[PDB]
């Protein structure tokens, strides 16, 4: 069947499994402290999260 | 919380919510 | 009380050259037990001059990359060198070092003021150049040889203090002064 082929290839690991929680894209991911949020998004929302440039 | 998230993760999760 | 390395009591040593007398810090005040110290001798300009010459030698030995910041390893080299100097000559190894630093420093050198005219040297320049030359002698001498660093460093300090011109330091020093006479 088509339902046996549509989503049957595993998405358990690798940068084809996890994605940005804004962009939905598969590159430059900040997985640290469970951000799960691409590096351009984090750089947009840093201020809003509580991340501050001091030193 | 029953899962009991880390304090590092909790304050980042609090920020992501606000964002 | 009494000093250097265990066994090379400082005062005894005469600095023959009254020109380098100030900047060869060996005697009376600079008598310390090791060639090791905290440092701060390279913070201000001439603070270098008030560093004991055995620490200067130790520092200038750890060179050609692989040795950088292996000071304890060259504290040891200079220790074993001073052993060899005393046994092979019969003098106070400090006196042999001071005599070498005096005889190994080029007294005038050429520079670009064309065909590069000759000028004089600072006494501190002579001490710096002397330490460099006889260490670069010891380092080159030992490379791909069964002879050790402490032997090569001893033999360079002897042949320099002796005034041999068989040393690397005295041959290059004569070579600098010879080029300097060639354009004065």
């Amino acid at each position: 069947g088509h339902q046996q082929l549509y989503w049957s290839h595993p998405r358990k690991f690798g940068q084809g499994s996890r994605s940005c929680r804004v962009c939905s894209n598969r590159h430059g991911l900040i997985r640290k402290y469970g951000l799960n949020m691409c590096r351009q998004c984090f750089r947009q929302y840093a201020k809003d999260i509580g991340f501050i440039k001091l030193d | 919380m029953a899962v009991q998230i880390s304090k590092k993760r909790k304050f980042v999760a609090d920020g992501i919510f606000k964002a | 009380d009494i000093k250097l390395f265990g066994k090379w009591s400082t005062d005894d040593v005469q600095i023959n050259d009254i020109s380098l007398q100030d900047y060869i810090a060996v005697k009376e005040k600079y008598a310390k037990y090791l060639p090791h110290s905290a440092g701060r001798y390279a913070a201000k300009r001439f603070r270098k001059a008030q560093c004991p010459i055995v620490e200067r030698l130790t520092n200038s030995m750890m060179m050609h990359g692989r040795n950088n910041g292996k000071k304890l390893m060259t504290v040891r080299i200079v220790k074993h060198a001073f052993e060899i100097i005393h046994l092979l000559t019969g003098e106070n190894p400090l006196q042999v070092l001071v005599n070498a630093i005096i005889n190994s420093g080029p007294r005038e050198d050429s520079t670009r003021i064309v065909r590069r005219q000759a000028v004089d040297v600072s006494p501190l320049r002579r001490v710096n150049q002397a330490i460099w030359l006889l260490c670069t002698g010891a380092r080159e001498a030992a490379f791909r040889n069964i002879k050790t660093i402490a032997e090569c460093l001893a033999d360079e300090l002897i042949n320099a203090a002796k005034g041999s011109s068989n040393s690397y330091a005295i041959k290059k020093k004569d070579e600098l002064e010879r080029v300097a006479k060639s354009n004065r």
């Binding site: - | - | 310390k32 037990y33 090791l34 090791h36 905290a38 000071k71 304890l72």
Partner: protein, 142 residues
């Protein structure tokens, strides 16, 4: 008898060494082992310098336990060098007259400032665009 203990530290880098000057006889040791076997032996005299410059008679009435942690081998040696020195100067401040403490501070500072004053030098932070603080990655032209 009463408590004549003074607990004085010495830093020479990220190594903190705290020496403990009690009343008693002349035993000086570091984490329970005496100074004659603290490695490296290359810097044997560096620990004996306050013992040599002052003599055993200063450390006759005092016994010094030294706790050391942090830094590396040479930093820990310079830490304990500074600690037992500063700790005796602190013992001779409180538990004898300032005349003895003045006399001894003089003889130590005259030899090496670092016996009683900590070097404020610390490992400078690396910056991006290089392998360390000042050094940069190799620039390529053409």
């Amino acid at each position: 008898g009463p408590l004549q203990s003074v607990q004085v530290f010495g830093r020479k880098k990220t190594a903190t060494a705290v020496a403990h000057c009690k009343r008693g006889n002349g035993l000086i040791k570091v984490n329970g082992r005496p100074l004659e076997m603290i490695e490296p032996r290359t810097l044997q005299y560096k620990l004996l310098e306050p013992v040599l410059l002052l003599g055993k008679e200063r450390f006759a009435g005092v016994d010094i336990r030294v706790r050391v942690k942090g830094g590396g081998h040479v930093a820990q040696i310079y830490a304990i060098r500074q600690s037992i020195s500063k700790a005796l100067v602190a013992y001779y401040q409180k538990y004898v007259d300032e005349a003895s403490k003045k006399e001894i501070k003089d003889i130590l500072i005259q030899y090496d400032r670092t016996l009683l004053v900590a070097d404020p030098r610390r490992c400078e932070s690396k910056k991006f665009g290089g392998p360390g603080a000042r050094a940069r990655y190799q620039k390529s032209y053409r």
